[PDB]
Every structure is written in C-alpha cells, then in structure tokens.
Amino acid sequence: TRIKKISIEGNIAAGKSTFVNILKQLSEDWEVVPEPVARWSNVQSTQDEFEELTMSQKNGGNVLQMMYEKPERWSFTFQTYACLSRIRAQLASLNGKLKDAEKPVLFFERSVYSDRYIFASNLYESESMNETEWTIYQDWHDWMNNQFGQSLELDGIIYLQATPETCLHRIYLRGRNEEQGIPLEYLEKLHYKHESWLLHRTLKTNFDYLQEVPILTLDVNEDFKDKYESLVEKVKEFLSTL
Amino acid sequence: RIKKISIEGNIAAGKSTFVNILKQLSEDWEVVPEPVARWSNVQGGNVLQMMYEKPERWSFTFQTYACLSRIRAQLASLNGKLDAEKPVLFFERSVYSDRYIFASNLYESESMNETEWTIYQDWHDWMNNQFSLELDGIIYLQATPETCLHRIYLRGRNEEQGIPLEYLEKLHYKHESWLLHRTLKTNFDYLQEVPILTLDVNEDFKKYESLVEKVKEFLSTL
Numbered sequence A: 001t002r003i004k005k006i007s008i009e010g011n012i013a014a015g016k017s018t019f020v021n022i023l024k025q026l027s028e029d030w031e032v033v034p035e036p037v038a039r040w041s042n043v044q045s046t047q048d049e050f051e052e053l054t055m056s057q058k059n060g061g062n063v064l065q066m067m068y069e070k071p072e073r074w075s076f077t078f079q080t081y082a083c084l085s086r087i088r089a090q091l092a093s094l095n096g097k098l099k100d101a102e103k104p105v106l107f108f109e110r111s112v113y114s115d116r117y118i119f120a121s122n123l124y125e126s127e128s129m130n131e132t133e134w135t136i137y138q139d140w141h142d143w144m145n146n147q148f149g150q151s152l153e154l155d156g157i158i159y160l161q162a163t164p165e166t167c168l169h170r171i172y173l174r175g176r177n178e179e180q181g182i183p184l185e186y187l188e189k190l191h192y193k194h195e196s197w198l199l200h201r202t203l204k205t206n207f208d209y210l211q212e213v214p215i216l217t218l219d220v221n222e223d224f225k226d227k228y229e230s231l232v233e234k235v236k237e238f239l240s241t242l
Numbered sequence B: 001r002i003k004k005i006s007i008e009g010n011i012a013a014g015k016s017t018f019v020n021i022l023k024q025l026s027e028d029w030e031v032v033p034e035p036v037a038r039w040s041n042v043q044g045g046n047v048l049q050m051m052y053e054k055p056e057r058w059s060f061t062f063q064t065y066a067c068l069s070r071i072r073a074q075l076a077s078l079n080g081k082l083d084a085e086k087p088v089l090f091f092e093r094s095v096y097s098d099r100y101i102f103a104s105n106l107y108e109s110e111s112m113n114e115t116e117w118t119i120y121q122d123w124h125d126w127m128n129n130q131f132s133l134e135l136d137g138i139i140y141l142q143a144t145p146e147t148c149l150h151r152i153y154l155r156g157r158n159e160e161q162g163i164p165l166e167y168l169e170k171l172h173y174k175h176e177s178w179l180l181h182r183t184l185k186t187n188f189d190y191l192q193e194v195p196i197l198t199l200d201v202n203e204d205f206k207k208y209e210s211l212v213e214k215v216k217e218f219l220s221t222l
Ligand SMILES: Nc1ncnc2c1ncn2[C@@H]1O[C@H](COP(=O)(O)OP(=O)(O)O)[C@@H](O)[C@H]1O
Pocket: A010, A011, A012, A013, A014, A015, A016, A017, A018, A019, A170, A171, A173, A174, A175, A220, A221, A222, A223, A224, A225
C-alpha cells in the first residue's frame, strides 16, 4: 500500500527497540510494530466474551524459556508461534495505523524473514529441529507468505550491527530473565547468519525481491549518545531513497 | 456460492468411501479428501506415525500440520473446479473437528500440555479468522467404535493397526457430544445454525440406497 515498510534487523540486545522507539518520535508519520516477545514469555489465548467478565487472564506458559531450556523439544513449537504472532501484529498495524499520514513509514522490529532464515534455520543447523520439523515449518512459512502477496513485502531493511560481545553485555544490562544463561557461542552463530543475509548478502531465500531490497547497515557498538546523531542522518537519507 | 458440506465421523466410519460414491451423482459435486497421504509422507518423515508412537512429543506438531494441510486443500478447491449450476463441495472433515475433536482429545489425554494447547487454539483462532470455508451443512456418519475398529483392519493402513478400541470410544463420545447431543461448544457462533444430517453407516454397504437419497435431498433444503 502507501505505507513504506522498513524492518529493523539485528541480534538479540543489539539495541533495535531502543533505537527505533526514539527514532520514530522524529515524525508523526512514523510508527513501530514491536516484536511480540512478551507474548512468548507469557503464552495466552483469547478469552470467551462472558468468561472474561468474571475470570482474569492468567499467566500462561513460558514457551521462550522452554525453548532455551530444551531446544530439541521446543524449537519447532516456539518458531511456529513466534512467526504467527509476528505476522498477526504486523498485519493489524498495517491495516489500522498511519491512516491520516502524508508519508507513512511503518518500522517492523524484525521480520518473517529473520524468523525463518536466522532463527529457525540456526535451530535446524543445530539439530534442534529435525528434518520433519524443518520441512513442516518451511511449508507453513511459504504458504502463509504466498497468501499475503505484497502485503508485508519490505521496502527497506536497516541492519543494526553489533558484536556478539556487545549483545551479550546488553542482554545483561536489559536483564530479561530468560536470556540470562545465553552463551556467547549462540549469539555468535546468530551474528554470522545476520552477516551472510544482510552484509555479505550471500544467503539465498525463497523470496526473490529480497535480493534487491535496499539495506542500510548501522554500527551500533558505541554508547548511544556517541553515534545517534549520525545514525539518524543516515536513516533519513536512506528513507528519502525508497 | 459453492455449498460447502463437511462429512464428519470416526476413523474408518466410511467417509471417504461414501463421498467418493456421492461424488458421481452430479458433475456439480466435488470432494476435498482428508490429506492423510501428506501426513504419512511429509514433503519424508511419517508425522502421523510419529504422533501415534510418541503422542506426548508429536501431537502438537501433527495437529498443526494436519489443520494447515486441510485448510490449504479446501481453499485450493474453492479456487476453481466448479461455472456450475448448483455447486457442492464435500469436505472430508473440517477445521472444527481438527480442534474440537482430535486436538481437544489429545489435550484431554495429556498428549498436549497447557502451553501447547494454548498455542494451538491461538494459531487456530488466527488461521481460521483470515481463511470462506464456512459450512452450509454437515453430514455425520455414525458408526460404533467396534465397527470403526473392524474397518480399520479392513483398510489396513499401517499407522493405524495398533489403535485400541478405547481411543475410538473417546473419539466417538466427542463426535456424539458435538453432532448429536449438541453439547459441544465452539467459539464459532454460526455453527449452531448449520443443519446436521446424521446417517447410520454401521451396516454393510448393501443401506446405501436410502443414504444417498437422504443426502441428495438434505442438500435441496440448503
Ligand atoms: N547504543 C547503546 N548504548 C548503551 N545501551 C544500549 C544501546 N542500545 C541499546 N542499549 C541497551 O541495551 C539493552 C538492549 O537494547 P534493546 O533495544 O532492548 O535490544 P533489542 O530490542 O535489539 O533486543 C537495553 O538495556 C538498552 O537500554
């Protein structure tokens, strides 16, 4: 549609939510679809219309934690749910926000492509999904994407590049409970997937237009004040090109 | 404008048989078979078998793929093969029996945990709510669990050969609660309005005259 869709990609705790949520104050025509991580650590489904008047919406399972604890059991289930909740949030925001905007830009915290080609794929490569799980996942992912056509197609990607060591430190700073045992090696594997996809651009996907989508790579290893001015200038220049 | 009728009933009640027969009565009638071949050869792995052998491990993966694969087949069949006077599409089962019979039963038996069941409902809610498949009517083929158990052996699907009577009793009570007693509640409000034709298929196929005529004309009321 008229809404430009820009995905913000980068490793866990690179600083995507921080950067984008400050950035988007620069324009009333700019909005963000946050990644549904809260929904993964407290798994809930919709209450009946009458039941919710007399029953609380209780805390459900922690599928994020289950995946970290036993990835060979929970990876498929986690990845399925992560992508479904993402698509759901991105579509609803597409169809409902920025209606009265002159040059609307919707920023996505990550995309369905990072779900598959970074996160799920890394789990398949780690033998945390077997051939059957990997086949089911890709089949479902392809199907959903063909269903939407150009709906979610990206106009641009901003890659926030941080070292695995930076991300590890920032995981500690943020203090999300389920992330606290994450080892450097896991971040490193994820780092490598981001570099292949977004920087060296050697990673091949089932979605041909991606080979051509413009990418802005930003180095976010510095303390926030130290580069923010220059990053904002780069983003504004990049967007003028789309 | 295609009438959509689902055929519901226990494993080996005889849904595929009956509808393949019914199919031939009119050029305006087509069938969407349950994608069971896709389930025993994932394209590969036999996720149907994986689920029967280790249901606590594989039930959620199986259920999700079973429902996905069904939705896909049903949508594709609407998308052009019936430019017909009065088109009817007969579905072998529905996304409702996926959730409210099979998946629910697996949850009830603890083959899915609370998280798995919540994820599955949430996925099923969203998946359905986009993807057109609403039923005009349901035909319920009612066979005793002992009949179904016999017919499992007749058909000889390898993945099915160990199925116990008790498991079929459980599925039978679910179907009965949904389609006969009507005590099974779904979060699909329109389903309370859908007419149900219940047909007893326990005898050897030589009541089939009576049953076809009863369908032929249940349809004329829709
Ligand atoms: N440039 C930066 N300098 C110092 N801290 C940062 C910087 N960017 C992000 N942070 C901090 O790092 C942590 C993770 O950032 P966050 O934006 O939540 O990451 P993401 O959304 O990419 O997972 C937070 O505690 C945040 O305050």
